[PDB]
Design a protein around this ligand. Structure first.
Ligand SMILES: C[S@@+](CC[C@H](N)C(=O)[O-])C[C@H]1O[C@@H](n2cnc3c(N)ncnc32)[C@H](O)[C@@H]1O
Ligand SMILES: C[S@@+](CC[C@H](N)C(=O)[O-])C[C@H]1O[C@@H](n2cnc3c(N)ncnc32)[C@H](O)[C@@H]1O
Lengths: 385, 385
C-alpha cells in the first residue's frame, strides 16, 4: 500500500555518534542514502537499527535523527515529545523556553512560552515538512491561547525554506506582555519577530538583581528591552541602558514608566558609547552578539572583545562587578578568560572570578551534542589587594 | 643602619607575569638573584619596581610575591591582609575559609574558620619564616579562641620544612564541633583530614539538599563525615555513605545520631563497593580525592574515573542525578565531560548537563592565578527521550 520504507545506511565506524544520541549525519558519513526524501530509518553497516529521522539533501544536515528507537514520526510521537518537554519545564514559571530543538528530541523546532502565548521557530526542512503532524500535537498538549511564528530568515534560507511570520493559531496580542519575576515588558510583535525575548538570561538576571544595592550605578550594555537595567532600578540603583535598537529601548522606557522607575537610556553603539563615558559604575554588564562562523575568525573576535572589555573595566568602580556573556558555541569560557586577562593587563587591574554560569535548564545542554552549549557568562569582581 | 634592600632582577620579558599579579617567579626567569635569603624586592630589567616577596632557593618557587606595591612585610602589612580577608568573608556565616593563599595575597598560607577556632597550614618557606610577624597580626584581627596547625606533610617537606601539628594559640577542643546549616559534626582533630572539614563543598551541599525528595535513595561516595548524606537523610531520603576512612564514618554516625537521623554506611573503597551494588539510586554523588597530583597521571586517573562513573551511572535511577567533582587543578571540566560521555556510551544512557559549579567565594579563584581554582563539579541528569 505504501512506498518502500526509506532506509539510510551509515558508513562503518560512523554509526557510533548516532548510537550515542548525536542526531546529525552529514553526507560523508552516509554509505547509502534513502531512495527519496522524507521520513527515513537509519541503520548501521550490518543493518542494525540506529534511528528514525528526516532525510533531505537540501537540508544543512542531510539526515537529522528525530528518535533513537523504532517507530513513526506520527501525531502520538510528537504528543509524547511535547508532553516530555512540558514536564521538564514544571516549576519554571510562566515565561520559559518549552522546546529547545535537538536537545529536546525535536530537531529544528524552537518553542518559547509567554504565559498562554507560544512563539515558535521552525529551522529545518524535516520539521517544516512535518508541520501538519506536530502542530496539532503541540496545541493538544499545551492548549495555548495563541501561537505566533517568527523566522530566523538566514536559517530558513540556508534550508531553502521561505520566511514565515504570523499567528499560527488562536489569539496573539499586538503587544506581547512578557512577564518575568514581576516585571512586565510590552513587546510589539514587529520587535518580537526581528529579535524576540532572551529567556536564556533569566537566571543571570535573577543573580544580578540579588547583588544590586540601592544607590549603586549600573551600566547595562547590549540591554535589549532592559531586563538587567530594570531590575537594577527596582532595587534602587541608577541604571544606564545602552542598545542600538531604538525599538527595544522604547519597550524598556514603557516598562520603566509602568513601575515608576527611572532608567537612563542611551541609543547608540556599545564601543563608541563606552569610549565616551567616564564612569565609574558598580556593575557593568556586557551581552554582545558574538557571531562566529569559522574558527579562524576567533582571534579577530577576541581582539574586538578586548576593546570592549578594556572600556568596561576602565568604567568599573573599585570592587565592582563586570559581567561578560558570549552566546556562541565557538567562543568558550577559556576565550572569555583570555580576553579578560588581556584587558586587565592593559589597565593594571586585579580581578577575581566571581561566578561562571551557563544557560538555564529550559535551554538544555545535552552531554551528547557538544554544540548544545552556546551561552556562558563570566562574572568578575574587581579584587584589589 | 640596615643592610641594602635585597633586590632581585627579572629577565627581560619575563616580568609581565608579576606585573599582572601572578606571584610566582621561577629559577629560569631570574636574571640576577638578591644577595641572600629573605624579604626581597623584585625589579625588572630596567630596575623598575615589581613586587616585594620572599626569595629562597630552597622553596619550590624561588620567589613568591607577597605584595605588588612598595613596602615592608611587617605586622601592619599582615594586619591589612587579614583585615581584607575578613571583610571578604562577611555574611559567609561562622564557618568558611578565611585565607586561600596567593589568591588572598598571602602565598603559602591557608586559614579555615570554624566558629571561634582557626585551623591553618603553612605551605612555603616565606610564610614559615615570617610567622613571628603574621601570627600575632592574625590573632589581633580575628581574635579567635584558639588556633590549630595542621601540616600538608608532603608540601612541607618539598619546602624543606618539618612537620608541624598542634595548637599554636589559645584553646582548641580535642573534638572540633564543625557547624554547617544546622548540622554539627564532632570531628576529632587528631584523626581529622586536612583542616578537619571540606568547606569548599558547602555551596554544592546546599544545591544538593534542595533537590532531595522524601523516599528517594541517595548514594554518597567518598562521603567523608557525610555532609551530603546527612542532608539527604534530613530531607527524608535513604542515604548510603561510602568511605574508606573509618574514623570519618564514625563522625557521620555520631552526627546522625545527635539528630535522630538514620544513615546507612559502608566502610570500603569506592570502585569495589559500587561494583557490588545493584541500585538504583535517585542521586549518586562522587567526590574523589585529588587523584591527579601531577599532569602525567591524568590519563590513568581518567581511565579509573571511567570505571567509577560507569558503575555510578549503572546505579542511577531513571531521571536521576549524578554528581562528579574534581578537586585537582589538572583534572578539568572537559576531562569530566569526556569521562561522562565514555561511561554513558558504554551503557547506552542519554544524559543532560544539569549544572556545572566551581568552588565558592571563600576559596577565591583569581583571574591571575589559574591554580587558585582546583574544584569544579559536573552535575548530570539522566535524560531519556
Ligand atoms: C543578546 S541581546 C542582549 C539581551 C539582554 N542582555 C537581555 O537581558 O535581554 C543583544 C543586543 O545587542 C544589541 N546590539 C547588537 N550590536 C550592538 C552594538 N554594536 N551596540 C549596541 N547594541 C548592539 C541588539 O539590539 C540586542 O538587543
Ligand atoms: C574530597 S573528600 C570528600 C568530602 C565529602 N564529599 C564532603 O562533602 O565532606 C575525599 C574522601 O575520599 C575518601 N577516600 C579516598 N580514597 C577513597 C577510596 N578509594 N574509596 C572511598 N573513599 C576514599 C577520603 O577518606 C575522603 O573522605
Amino acid at each position: 500500500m505504501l512506498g518502500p520504507v526509506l532506509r539510510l545506511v551509515v558508513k562503518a565506524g560512523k554509526e557510533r555518534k548516532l548510537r550515542n544520541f548525536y542526531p546529525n549525519l552529514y553526507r560523508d558519513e552516509i554509505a547509502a542514502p534513502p531512495e527519496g526524501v522524507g521520513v527515513a530509518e537509519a541503520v548501521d553497516a550490518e543493518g542494525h537499527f540506529l534511528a528514525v529521522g528526516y532525510y533531505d539533501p537540501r537540508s544543512r544536515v542531510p539526515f537529522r535523527a528525530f528518535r533513537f528507537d523504532p517507530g513513526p514520526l506520527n501525531r502520538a510521537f510528537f504528543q509524547g515529545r511535547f508532553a516530555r518537554a512540558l514536564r521538564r519545564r514544571q516549576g519554571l514559571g510562566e515565561s520559559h523556553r518549552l522546546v529547545h530543538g535537538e536537545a529536546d528530541g525535536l530537531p529544528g523546532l524552537v518553542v518559547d512560552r509567554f504565559g498562554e502565548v507560544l512563539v515558535l521557530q521552525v529551522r529545518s526542512r524535516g520539521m517544516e515538512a512535518l508541520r501538519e503532524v506536530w502542530l496539532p500535537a503541540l496545541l493538544e498538549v499545551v492548549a495555548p491561547k495563541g501561537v505566533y511564528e517568527r523566522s530566523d530568515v538566514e536559517a530558513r534560507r540556508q534550508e531553502g525554506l521561505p520566511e514565515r511570520v504570523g499567528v499560527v493559531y488562536g489569539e496573539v496580542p499586538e503587544v506581547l506582555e512578557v512577564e518575568e519575576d514581576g516585571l512586565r515588558f510590552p513587546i510589539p510583535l514587529a520587535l518580537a519577530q526581528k529579535t524576540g525575548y532572551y529567556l536564556d538570561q533569566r537566571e543571570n538576571r535573577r543573580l544580578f538583581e540579588a547583588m544590586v544595592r540601592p544607590g549603586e550605578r549600573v551600566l547595562d550594555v547590549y540591554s535589549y528591552v532592559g531586563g538587567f537595567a530594570l531590575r537594577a532600578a527596582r532595587k534602587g540603583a541608577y541604571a544606564l541602558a545602552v542598545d542600538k535598537d531604538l525599538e527595544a529601548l522604547g519597550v524598556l522606557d514603557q516598562a520603566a514608566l509602568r513601575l515608576g522607575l527611572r532608567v537612563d537610556i542611551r541609543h547608540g553603539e556599545a564601543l563608541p558609547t563606552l569610549r565616551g563615558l567616564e564612569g565609574p559604575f558598580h556593575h557593568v554588564l556586557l551581552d554582545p552578539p558574538t557571531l562566529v562562523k569559522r574558527p579562524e575568525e576567533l582571534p579577530a573576535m577576541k581582539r574586538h572583545l578586548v576593546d570592549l572589555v578594556r572600556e568596561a573595566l576602565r568604567l568599573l568602580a573599585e570592587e565592582g562587578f563586570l559581567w561578560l556573556s558570549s552566546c556562541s558555541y565557538h567562543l568558550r569560557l577559556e576565550d572569555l578568560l583570555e580576553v579578560a586577562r588581556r584587558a586587565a593587563a592593559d589597565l593594571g587591574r586585579r580581578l577575581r572570578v566571581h561566578r561562571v554560569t551557563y544557560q538555564p535548564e529550559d535551554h538544555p545542554w545535552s552531554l551528547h551534542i557538544p554544540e548544545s552549549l552556546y551561552l556562558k557568562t563570566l562574572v568578575l569582581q574587581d579584587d584589589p589587594l
